[PDB]
Amino acid sequence: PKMKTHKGAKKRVKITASGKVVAMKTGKRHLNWQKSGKEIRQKGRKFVLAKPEAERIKLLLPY
Amino acid sequence: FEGGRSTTLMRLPKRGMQGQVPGEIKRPRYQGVNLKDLARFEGEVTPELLVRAGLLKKGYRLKILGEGEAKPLKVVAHAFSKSALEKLKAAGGEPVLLEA
Amino acid sequence: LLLECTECKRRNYATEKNKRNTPNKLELRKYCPWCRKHTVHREV
Amino acid sequence: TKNGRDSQAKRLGVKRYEGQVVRAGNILVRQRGTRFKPGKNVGMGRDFTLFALVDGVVEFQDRGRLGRYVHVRPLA
RNA sequence: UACCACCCUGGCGCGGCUGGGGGCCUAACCCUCGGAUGGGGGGACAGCGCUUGGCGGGCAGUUUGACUGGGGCGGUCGCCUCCUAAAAGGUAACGGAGGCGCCCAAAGGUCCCCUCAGGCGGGACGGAAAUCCGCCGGAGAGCGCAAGGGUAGAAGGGGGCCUGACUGCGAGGCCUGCAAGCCGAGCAGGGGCGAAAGCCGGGCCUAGUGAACCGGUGGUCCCGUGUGGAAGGGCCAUCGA
RNA sequence: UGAAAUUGAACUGGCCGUGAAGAUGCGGCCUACCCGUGGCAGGACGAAAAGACCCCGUGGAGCUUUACUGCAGCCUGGUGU
RNA sequence: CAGGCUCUGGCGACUGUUUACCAAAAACACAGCUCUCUGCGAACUCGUAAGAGGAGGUAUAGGGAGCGACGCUUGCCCGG
RNA sequence: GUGAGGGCGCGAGCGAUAACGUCCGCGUCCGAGCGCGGGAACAACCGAGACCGCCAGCUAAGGCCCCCAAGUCUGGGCUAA
RNA sequence: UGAAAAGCUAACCGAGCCCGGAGAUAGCUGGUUCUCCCCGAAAUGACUUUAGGGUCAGCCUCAGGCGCUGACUGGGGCCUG
RNA sequence: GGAGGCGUAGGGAAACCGAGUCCGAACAGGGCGUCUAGUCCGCGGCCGUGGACCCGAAACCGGGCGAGCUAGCCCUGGCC
RNA sequence: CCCCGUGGUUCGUGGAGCCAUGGGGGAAUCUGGGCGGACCACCGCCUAAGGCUAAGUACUCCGGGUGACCGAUAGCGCACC
RNA sequence: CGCGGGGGGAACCUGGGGAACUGAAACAUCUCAGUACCCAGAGGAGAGGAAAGAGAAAUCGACUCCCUGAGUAGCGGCGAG
Ligand SMILES: [Mg+2]
Ligand SMILES: [Mg+2]
Ligand SMILES: [Mg+2]
Ligand SMILES: [Mg+2]
Ligand SMILES: [Mg+2]
Ligand SMILES: [Mg+2]
Ligand SMILES: [Mg+2]
Ligand SMILES: [Mg+2]
Ligand SMILES: [Mg+2]
Ligand SMILES: [Mg+2]
Ligand SMILES: [Mg+2]
Ligand SMILES: [Mg+2]
Ligand SMILES: [Mg+2]
Ligand SMILES: [Mg+2]
Ligand SMILES: [Mg+2]
Ligand SMILES: [Mg+2]
Ligand SMILES: [Mg+2]
Ligand SMILES: [Mg+2]
Ligand SMILES: [Mg+2]
Ligand SMILES: [Mg+2]
Ligand SMILES: [Mg+2]
Ligand SMILES: [Mg+2]
Ligand SMILES: [Mg+2]
Ligand SMILES: [Mg+2]
Ligand SMILES: [Mg+2]
Ligand SMILES: [Mg+2]
Ligand SMILES: [Mg+2]
Ligand SMILES: [Mg+2]
Ligand SMILES: [Mg+2]
Ligand SMILES: [Mg+2]
Ligand SMILES: [Mg+2]
Ligand SMILES: [Mg+2]
Ligand SMILES: [Mg+2]
Ligand SMILES: [Mg+2]
Ligand SMILES: [Mg+2]
Ligand SMILES: [Mg+2]
Ligand SMILES: [Mg+2]
Ligand SMILES: [Mg+2]
Ligand SMILES: [Mg+2]
Ligand SMILES: [Mg+2]
Ligand SMILES: [Mg+2]
Ligand SMILES: [Mg+2]
Ligand SMILES: [Mg+2]
Ligand SMILES: [Mg+2]
Ligand SMILES: [Mg+2]
Ligand SMILES: [Mg+2]
Ligand SMILES: [Mg+2]
Ligand SMILES: [Mg+2]
Ligand SMILES: [Mg+2]
Ligand SMILES: [Mg+2]
Ligand SMILES: [Mg+2]
Ligand SMILES: [Mg+2]
Ligand SMILES: [Mg+2]
Ligand SMILES: [Mg+2]
Ligand SMILES: [Mg+2]
Ligand SMILES: [Mg+2]
Ligand SMILES: [Mg+2]
Ligand SMILES: [Mg+2]
Ligand SMILES: [Mg+2]
Ligand SMILES: [Mg+2]
Ligand SMILES: [Mg+2]
Ligand SMILES: [Mg+2]
Ligand SMILES: [Mg+2]
Ligand SMILES: [Mg+2]
Ligand SMILES: [Mg+2]
Ligand SMILES: [Mg+2]
Ligand SMILES: [Mg+2]
Ligand SMILES: [Mg+2]
Ligand SMILES: [Mg+2]
Ligand SMILES: [Mg+2]
Ligand SMILES: [Mg+2]
Ligand SMILES: [Mg+2]
Ligand SMILES: [Mg+2]
Ligand SMILES: [Mg+2]
Ligand SMILES: [Mg+2]
Ligand SMILES: [Mg+2]
Ligand SMILES: [Mg+2]
Ligand SMILES: [Mg+2]
Ligand SMILES: [Mg+2]
Ligand SMILES: [Mg+2]
Ligand SMILES: [Mg+2]
Ligand SMILES: [Mg+2]
Ligand SMILES: [Mg+2]
Ligand SMILES: [Mg+2]
Ligand SMILES: [Mg+2]
Ligand SMILES: [Mg+2]
Ligand SMILES: [Mg+2]
Ligand SMILES: [Mg+2]
Ligand SMILES: [Mg+2]
Ligand SMILES: [Mg+2]
Ligand SMILES: [Mg+2]
Ligand SMILES: [Mg+2]
Ligand SMILES: [Mg+2]
Ligand SMILES: [Mg+2]
Ligand SMILES: [Mg+2]
Ligand SMILES: [Mg+2]
Ligand SMILES: [Mg+2]
Ligand SMILES: [Mg+2]
Ligand SMILES: [Mg+2]
Ligand SMILES: [Mg+2]
Ligand SMILES: [Mg+2]
Ligand SMILES: [Mg+2]
Ligand SMILES: [Mg+2]
Ligand SMILES: [Mg+2]
Ligand SMILES: [Mg+2]
Ligand SMILES: [Mg+2]
Ligand SMILES: [Mg+2]
Ligand SMILES: [Mg+2]
Ligand SMILES: [Mg+2]
Ligand SMILES: [Mg+2]
Ligand SMILES: [Mg+2]
Ligand SMILES: [Mg+2]
Ligand SMILES: [Mg+2]
Ligand SMILES: [Mg+2]
Ligand SMILES: [Mg+2]
Ligand SMILES: [Mg+2]
Ligand SMILES: [Mg+2]
Ligand SMILES: [Mg+2]
Ligand SMILES: [Mg+2]
Ligand SMILES: [Mg+2]
Ligand SMILES: [Mg+2]
Ligand SMILES: [Mg+2]
Ligand SMILES: [Mg+2]
Ligand SMILES: [Mg+2]
Ligand SMILES: [Mg+2]
Ligand SMILES: [Mg+2]
Ligand SMILES: [Mg+2]
Ligand SMILES: [Mg+2]
Ligand SMILES: [Mg+2]
Ligand SMILES: [Mg+2]
Ligand SMILES: [Mg+2]
Ligand SMILES: [Mg+2]
Ligand SMILES: [Mg+2]
Ligand SMILES: [Mg+2]
Ligand SMILES: [Mg+2]
Ligand SMILES: [Mg+2]
Ligand SMILES: [Mg+2]
Ligand SMILES: [Mg+2]
Ligand SMILES: [Mg+2]
Ligand SMILES: [Mg+2]
Ligand SMILES: [Mg+2]
Ligand SMILES: [Mg+2]
Ligand SMILES: [Mg+2]
Ligand SMILES: [Mg+2]
Ligand SMILES: [Mg+2]
Ligand SMILES: [Mg+2]
Ligand SMILES: [Mg+2]
Ligand SMILES: [Mg+2]
Ligand SMILES: [Mg+2]
Ligand SMILES: [Mg+2]
Ligand SMILES: [Mg+2]
Ligand SMILES: [Mg+2]
Ligand SMILES: [Mg+2]
Ligand SMILES: [Mg+2]
Ligand SMILES: [Mg+2]
Ligand SMILES: [Mg+2]
Ligand SMILES: [Mg+2]
Ligand SMILES: [Mg+2]
Ligand SMILES: [Mg+2]
Ligand SMILES: [Mg+2]
Ligand SMILES: [Mg+2]
Ligand SMILES: [Mg+2]
Ligand SMILES: [Mg+2]
Ligand SMILES: [Mg+2]
Ligand SMILES: [Mg+2]
Ligand SMILES: [Mg+2]
Ligand SMILES: [Mg+2]
Ligand SMILES: [Mg+2]
Ligand SMILES: [Mg+2]
Ligand SMILES: [Mg+2]
Ligand SMILES: [Mg+2]
Ligand SMILES: [Mg+2]
Ligand SMILES: [Mg+2]
Ligand SMILES: [Mg+2]
Ligand SMILES: [Mg+2]
Ligand SMILES: [Mg+2]
Ligand SMILES: [Mg+2]
Ligand SMILES: [Mg+2]
Ligand SMILES: [Mg+2]
Ligand SMILES: [Mg+2]
Ligand SMILES: [Mg+2]
Ligand SMILES: [Mg+2]
Ligand SMILES: [Mg+2]
Ligand SMILES: [Mg+2]
Ligand SMILES: [Mg+2]
Ligand SMILES: [Mg+2]
Ligand SMILES: [Mg+2]
Ligand SMILES: [Mg+2]
Ligand SMILES: [Mg+2]
Ligand SMILES: [Mg+2]
Ligand SMILES: [Mg+2]
Ligand SMILES: [Mg+2]
Ligand SMILES: [Mg+2]
Ligand SMILES: [Mg+2]
Ligand SMILES: [Mg+2]
Ligand SMILES: [Mg+2]
Ligand SMILES: [Mg+2]
Ligand SMILES: [Mg+2]
Ligand SMILES: [Mg+2]
Ligand SMILES: [Mg+2]
Ligand SMILES: [Mg+2]
Ligand SMILES: [Mg+2]
Ligand SMILES: [Mg+2]
Ligand SMILES: [Mg+2]
Ligand SMILES: [Mg+2]
Ligand SMILES: [Mg+2]
Ligand SMILES: [Mg+2]
Ligand SMILES: [Mg+2]
Ligand SMILES: [Mg+2]
Ligand SMILES: [Mg+2]
Ligand SMILES: [Mg+2]
Ligand SMILES: [Mg+2]
Ligand SMILES: [Mg+2]
Ligand SMILES: [Mg+2]
Ligand SMILES: [Mg+2]
Ligand SMILES: [Mg+2]
Ligand SMILES: [Mg+2]
Ligand SMILES: [Mg+2]
Ligand SMILES: [Mg+2]
Ligand SMILES: [Mg+2]
Ligand SMILES: [Mg+2]
Ligand SMILES: [Mg+2]
Ligand SMILES: [Mg+2]
Ligand SMILES: [Mg+2]
Ligand SMILES: [Mg+2]
Ligand SMILES: [Mg+2]
Ligand SMILES: [Mg+2]
Ligand SMILES: [Mg+2]
Ligand SMILES: [Mg+2]
Ligand SMILES: [Mg+2]
Ligand SMILES: [Mg+2]
Ligand SMILES: [Mg+2]
């Protein structure tokens, strides 16, 4: 009774004012040793998901 | 959950400042009330009147801002947007917050 | 051998890769920081 | 019996055909080496990919000993 | 090279703090003696309490992969190449064959110059094959490594200068269930080569790799539990599969 | 005097085909008036038992060890008595 | 009412013991041999403990282990 | 919901130019059309996609000597098993 | 407890019986009840201690919005081994 | 009964700023966000938490009940 | 009070305070002493190591009242000795 | 010699002890859960209770219970929870 906000999710995802799900980019914290500048740069931004988008949305809600 | 592979929990927490032990750090919270909505009614607006009628709700810190058209009325607040400041400057009077 | 080029007269870094035993004991190529613009960079 | 190997398909070839509108800089042909060469408003990247530099339409041309070229004949 | 001074190396005499080893004692504690307030043996040991590290199937909880012309045994498990694959893309089998888990401060950027393999003839040592000269010789050489595609109107060989093996971005696409992978014009900064046009965000290209979490080192607009610091955390960079 | 397991319902024949590849039940053909009693065990893939073998389940349990981790027990420094 | 006998192999010395309800045996046990622990508030076992067994026993005794009458004998190796 | 697919034709690998074998590709039918006519019988071969009724009619495949609807039809050959 | 078979411990002992935790869990098997009407799948792909289970995609269906775009077809242009 | 909730503004890790904001030296670019919706109750379809359609384990654990069967020993008698 | 081992709290050693306490060391009496999330300073809050205390709260053996509760396979296991 | 204890009570209450299945789609930290259950004690209730409190307001003012605060702040093999 009373759903629990999936703390593990909110700790890594943001819900955009329109209704989209934004999350950081993977692949930039380790594998690196000399990846292009182009790589790491584009790994700094954040993005959007699509269908799993709708999966997480449900794990928050009170949020 | 599921597949039983990696969910998508492959993504990661840039949500640094996730939180400390003693927890929340209490501090003044400013809510923006857009002056176009403020302009609606008249007389002289104050933090109380604003919450007393629809916006604010004891969030306590009043901040007129945003787009619209300023009423020539007096408007006590906790902070004005640069932009808001001027629209109302060229039409009426504008005092700052109490202090603490 | 992995390497990280520090900026001279400062403390920046870069994505690098020396070669140790192959004629690369030295290392001080030219690079470009965000503070200021363009300088030398040691091995480190 | 060692042999079960292979690599995954790289899905390459011409991506946009002759007489086809193209936007600013969308890919036109992905090729192993130089099965095709650049052309009017058509550069190529590291992997020998061929992409538009302008809008307009794509046209192919065989220049015999020279090679097979692909370019965009713009309009606006 | 008198004498005076701070101090070193090593040691001796005093006290301060502090510990290690032997011996004796008895009163704790323990055993014992026809009650014993006592006497005999042991003795600051042993027992027990807290805390240290160890040995530890005696006992306890679990773990001990999938594919698989039944299971096991054997083999295999990710990435590249080619074929199968039926002239788009894709496409299976414990179908046929081979590689990868790197390397290069030059094997990188640019400006200038240069063109092989191989066959015949001529040449002291050489000798089928070093190096030399002639002629023929469009790519059968070469391109660090597998294979394919490409390629001398250079991607190949040499040189001069150099370090774009940039920082801040990134229209637009390929590819794709997701995550990821890939190509990218042009803008700003600031720079390399070049007369200039212009080229440079590594290497002819397609393998040379690892989400997240946890933590390390450098930094830095940020946060810092009443306030100021500090502890710690965040952000950027990079590290340990 | 008087049970039992079993039992979808039956009006329950042979061969050669046939069919999910072993047919009283479909096809064709052949044989056969109706109902019992005594007796046999070829079929009804006859009864019985949700196959013990075998595989599967990220099932269980007993057991082993130089599998992992832990506990008893023991050994041990420090300290209290 | 009331033994069929004989010869000759294997296993186990022997009387015993056992899988109540598919195994009585070549399995266990046994007297006997060897190793080892134990000086007594013994070692070992049960118990958180007090305590108890050991034993109102004291190394010719007690616990543990393997072999298993008796005869002959029981080699070499101490790297793990 | 589904993530066992199955057969057939064609194009390949595997297989032995075996298999109601297997593994892909294109199509198809069964699956779910074991509803209807043909093929003796018979999911997937040929015909055809059943809203119900009719003691009407044309045709499909297949078939027209009897079981069994409809020609012992017409014409020209061949076969003697 | 056992002169040892894992024997026996109240007719089934590799850990007895009762009651409770308890509606353990069961990616497995079985079962799931009135009528009519429209549409109608799938047994693929990717990943999966995954393979008889799932997640996304594909394919079904309903509601709202879009309006000739869809299959298939004619012409023309390019790509293909 | 207005405590309280949702909605009226977003962006950013945050400090913060705000129809913007973040990245950035940038009045380049680009991400996200502006040009308004909402809420309360009933009803239905599905989702999450609980046994969550129903019936079924082999098992595990806690407290108790059993040696009137069977096993061993102890005491006291009997039998051959 | 500090240290060692722990428990409680949202707090799993975490920068780990607070409350509690098994072991060790071991104060003070208001110029005392605890606390405001390691620590330090400043500024606040509060007085430990003695005790008691109604109501508001929980429960239904028992009696009463009421039901879009059951009606003998239902309803408590028992309408019934 | 005098007053008191002893034992019982459905559920409820406090205190001393305190699991495993199961969840995590394996499992050990973790969860189930300080639940189940055992024990002692209280009583119509029991516990708690007048601040060495909270915590940011130079604010509040014993305890208990309900609403909300809030699935917030946090905790977490940052998994499941
Ligand atoms: Mg919104
Ligand atoms: Mg919102
Ligand atoms: Mg919306
Ligand atoms: Mg990474
Ligand atoms: Mg950056
Ligand atoms: Mg909320
Ligand atoms: Mg990360
Ligand atoms: Mg937060
Ligand atoms: Mg104005
Ligand atoms: Mg150097
Ligand atoms: Mg270094
Ligand atoms: Mg293969
Ligand atoms: Mg390939
Ligand atoms: Mg493949
Ligand atoms: Mg291939
Ligand atoms: Mg002295
Ligand atoms: Mg001294
Ligand atoms: Mg001294
Ligand atoms: Mg001494
Ligand atoms: Mg002495
Ligand atoms: Mg003496
Ligand atoms: Mg003495
Ligand atoms: Mg004396
Ligand atoms: Mg003592
Ligand atoms: Mg005495
Ligand atoms: Mg004495
Ligand atoms: Mg004495
Ligand atoms: Mg004495
Ligand atoms: Mg003495
Ligand atoms: Mg001594
Ligand atoms: Mg001592
Ligand atoms: Mg040892
Ligand atoms: Mg041992
Ligand atoms: Mg150990
Ligand atoms: Mg061990
Ligand atoms: Mg074990
Ligand atoms: Mg468990
Ligand atoms: Mg494992
Ligand atoms: Mg398997
Ligand atoms: Mg096999
Ligand atoms: Mg087979
Ligand atoms: Mg194997
Ligand atoms: Mg790759
Ligand atoms: Mg290929
Ligand atoms: Mg080819
Ligand atoms: Mg092809
Ligand atoms: Mg090919
Ligand atoms: Mg074809
Ligand atoms: Mg084709
Ligand atoms: Mg072919
Ligand atoms: Mg092809
Ligand atoms: Mg083959
Ligand atoms: Mg490596
Ligand atoms: Mg060089
Ligand atoms: Mg030559
Ligand atoms: Mg010649
Ligand atoms: Mg010569
Ligand atoms: Mg020679
Ligand atoms: Mg010669
Ligand atoms: Mg060529
Ligand atoms: Mg080669
Ligand atoms: Mg090559
Ligand atoms: Mg090819
Ligand atoms: Mg080649
Ligand atoms: Mg080639
Ligand atoms: Mg070639
Ligand atoms: Mg070549
Ligand atoms: Mg060159
Ligand atoms: Mg080069
Ligand atoms: Mg050069
Ligand atoms: Mg892009
Ligand atoms: Mg994508
Ligand atoms: Mg790659
Ligand atoms: Mg690719
Ligand atoms: Mg190269
Ligand atoms: Mg390629
Ligand atoms: Mg983890
Ligand atoms: Mg970190
Ligand atoms: Mg700093
Ligand atoms: Mg910045
Ligand atoms: Mg600060
Ligand atoms: Mg600071
Ligand atoms: Mg605080
Ligand atoms: Mg403050
Ligand atoms: Mg502070
Ligand atoms: Mg810091
Ligand atoms: Mg830091
Ligand atoms: Mg008959
Ligand atoms: Mg018949
Ligand atoms: Mg019959
Ligand atoms: Mg029939
Ligand atoms: Mg018949
Ligand atoms: Mg008869
Ligand atoms: Mg009779
Ligand atoms: Mg019979
Ligand atoms: Mg008989
Ligand atoms: Mg019959
Ligand atoms: Mg029979
Ligand atoms: Mg079965
Ligand atoms: Mg497993
Ligand atoms: Mg298991
Ligand atoms: Mg087990
Ligand atoms: Mg060892
Ligand atoms: Mg050992
Ligand atoms: Mg241990
Ligand atoms: Mg000790
Ligand atoms: Mg000690
Ligand atoms: Mg001592
Ligand atoms: Mg006689
Ligand atoms: Mg006799
Ligand atoms: Mg005789
Ligand atoms: Mg004999
Ligand atoms: Mg015998
Ligand atoms: Mg013998
Ligand atoms: Mg006898
Ligand atoms: Mg016996
Ligand atoms: Mg017997
Ligand atoms: Mg017997
Ligand atoms: Mg029995
Ligand atoms: Mg038996
Ligand atoms: Mg016998
Ligand atoms: Mg026996
Ligand atoms: Mg003996
Ligand atoms: Mg002997
Ligand atoms: Mg001895
Ligand atoms: Mg024991
Ligand atoms: Mg003990
Ligand atoms: Mg004794
Ligand atoms: Mg005795
Ligand atoms: Mg002995
Ligand atoms: Mg002899
Ligand atoms: Mg020997
Ligand atoms: Mg010998
Ligand atoms: Mg040895
Ligand atoms: Mg030795
Ligand atoms: Mg030795
Ligand atoms: Mg399948
Ligand atoms: Mg298939
Ligand atoms: Mg199909
Ligand atoms: Mg098919
Ligand atoms: Mg076949
Ligand atoms: Mg159909
Ligand atoms: Mg039919
Ligand atoms: Mg047939
Ligand atoms: Mg069918
Ligand atoms: Mg049919
Ligand atoms: Mg007619
Ligand atoms: Mg006709
Ligand atoms: Mg006809
Ligand atoms: Mg005729
Ligand atoms: Mg005729
Ligand atoms: Mg027995
Ligand atoms: Mg019983
Ligand atoms: Mg029985
Ligand atoms: Mg038994
Ligand atoms: Mg049992
Ligand atoms: Mg058991
Ligand atoms: Mg059940
Ligand atoms: Mg499941
Ligand atoms: Mg329909
Ligand atoms: Mg279909
Ligand atoms: Mg599957
Ligand atoms: Mg699903
Ligand atoms: Mg699905
Ligand atoms: Mg519609
Ligand atoms: Mg229209
Ligand atoms: Mg069209
Ligand atoms: Mg056409
Ligand atoms: Mg065409
Ligand atoms: Mg926000
Ligand atoms: Mg802009
Ligand atoms: Mg864009
Ligand atoms: Mg913008
Ligand atoms: Mg935009
Ligand atoms: Mg809005
Ligand atoms: Mg509603
Ligand atoms: Mg609803
Ligand atoms: Mg849902
Ligand atoms: Mg929920
Ligand atoms: Mg259940
Ligand atoms: Mg449900
Ligand atoms: Mg549910
Ligand atoms: Mg008895
Ligand atoms: Mg008896
Ligand atoms: Mg303290
Ligand atoms: Mg201690
Ligand atoms: Mg310690
Ligand atoms: Mg402590
Ligand atoms: Mg506790
Ligand atoms: Mg704790
Ligand atoms: Mg908690
Ligand atoms: Mg905790
Ligand atoms: Mg703590
Ligand atoms: Mg304390
Ligand atoms: Mg203490
Ligand atoms: Mg205190
Ligand atoms: Mg406080
Ligand atoms: Mg503080
Ligand atoms: Mg206070
Ligand atoms: Mg007080
Ligand atoms: Mg006091
Ligand atoms: Mg007091
Ligand atoms: Mg008090
Ligand atoms: Mg008190
Ligand atoms: Mg009271
Ligand atoms: Mg009440
Ligand atoms: Mg009543
Ligand atoms: Mg009543
Ligand atoms: Mg009533
Ligand atoms: Mg009623
Ligand atoms: Mg009745
Ligand atoms: Mg009844
Ligand atoms: Mg009745
Ligand atoms: Mg009845
Ligand atoms: Mg009752
Ligand atoms: Mg009654
Ligand atoms: Mg009676
Ligand atoms: Mg009665
Ligand atoms: Mg009295
Ligand atoms: Mg009383
Ligand atoms: Mg009482
Ligand atoms: Mg308690
Ligand atoms: Mg307790
Ligand atoms: Mg378990
Ligand atoms: Mg398990
Ligand atoms: Mg707990
Ligand atoms: Mg309790
Ligand atoms: Mg008591
Ligand atoms: Mg009582
Ligand atoms: Mg009270
Ligand atoms: Mg009290
Ligand atoms: Mg007081």
Side-chain angles (χ1 to χ4, degrees):
Chain A
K2 185 170 198 158
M3 316 206 307
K4 297 196 180 188
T5 51
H6 186 297
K7 286 296 171 181
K10 193 196 85 297
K11 290 196 205 288
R12 56 181 76 198
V13 149
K14 161 95 165 182
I15 195 147
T16 82
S18 78
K20 288 173 285 186
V21 198
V22 153
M24 289 298 306
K25 265 295 192 172
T26 38
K28 175 198 180 179
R29 200 12 77 116
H30 187 44
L31 75 188
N32 156 48
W33 77 310
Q34 194 181 57
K35 305 168 62 60
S36 92
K38 185 196 169 188
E39 273 285 64
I40 68 91
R41 275 192 292 92
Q42 314 195 87
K43 298 303 184 65
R45 62 184 172 179
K46 53 212 284 190
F47 63 100
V48 283
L49 313 96
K51 283 35 272 163
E53 262 188 333
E55 274 194 335
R56 261 152 281 73
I57 306 251
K58 269 273 218 164
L59 294 186
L60 313 131
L61 298 167
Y63 231 88
Chain B
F1 256 159
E2 282 321 271
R5 73 200 160 191
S6 285
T7 18
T8 311
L9 179 145
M10 291 175 51
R11 19 64 194 200
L12 48 297
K14 191 215 205 316
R15 273 37 171 182
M17 217 92 281
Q18 67 175 357
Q20 220 61 323
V21 163
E24 184 70 323
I25 22 65
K26 184 176 181 173
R27 70 176 47 144
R29 297 165 277 152
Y30 294 95
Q31 172 191 158
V33 30
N34 203 294
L35 55 70
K36 61 145 315 312
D37 293 319
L38 168 71
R40 181 182 78 205
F41 67 98
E42 211 185 29
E44 177 190 24
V45 301
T46 97
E48 184 58 290
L49 291 46
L50 269 327
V51 45
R52 185 148 287 269
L55 314 81
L56 243 283
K57 224 73 166 67
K58 299 183 185 183
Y60 187 50
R61 291 312 180 103
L62 195 182
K63 185 165 171 176
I64 18 50
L65 54 68
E67 15 74 333
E69 281 299 69
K71 253 50 179 174
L73 80 198
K74 209 177 179 77
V75 54
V76 183
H78 286 267
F80 302 67
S81 182
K82 285 52 157 183
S83 64
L85 204 295
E86 306 311 319
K87 289 192 165 188
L88 108 85
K89 209 177 183 71
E94 30 135 347
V96 84
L97 50 53
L98 22 290
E99 178 66 353
Chain C
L1 186 154
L2 258 320
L3 213 278
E4 40 273 330
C5 272
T6 191
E7 179 208 303
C8 295
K9 223 320 161 187
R10 204 168 303 161
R11 28 192 165 175
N12 177 229
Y13 285 90
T15 72
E16 225 322 66
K17 276 174 48 181
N18 205 22
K19 285 303 168 177
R20 191 73 188 262
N21 291 167
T22 37
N24 280 84
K25 321 300 147 297
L26 50 291
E27 186 81 29
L28 63 144
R29 278 46 193 175
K30 184 186 282 180
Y31 192 51
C32 167
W34 208 211
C35 189
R36 282 67 185 259
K37 272 298 188 181
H38 252 284
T39 41
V40 267
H41 281 67
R42 290 293 158 185
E43 175 157 324
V44 174
Chain D
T1 82
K2 21 74 161 182
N3 264 359
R5 270 148 297 193
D6 202 2
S7 62
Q8 101 147 348
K10 298 270 144 294
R11 310 144 211 283
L12 20 59
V14 182
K15 301 297 187 172
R16 263 70 204 292
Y17 292 149
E18 195 181 60
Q20 205 165 304
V21 184
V22 294
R23 258 280 137 202
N26 44 2
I27 296 198
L28 302 153
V29 151
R30 277 183 175 275
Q31 64 180 331
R32 312 163 186 172
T34 322
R35 318 198 64 88
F36 294 80
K37 296 182 172 180
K40 316 179 197 172
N41 327 316
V42 171
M44 61 148 269
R46 330 200 311 96
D47 61 359
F48 296 138
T49 294
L50 299 171
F51 56 110
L53 315 196
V54 311
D55 292 48
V57 178
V58 165
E59 67 182 344
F60 294 68
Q61 159 191 193
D62 181 28
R63 307 227 305 178
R65 327 257 196 102
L66 284 178
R68 292 170 56 192
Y69 293 54
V70 183
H71 20 237
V72 195
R73 61 162 175 166
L75 31 58

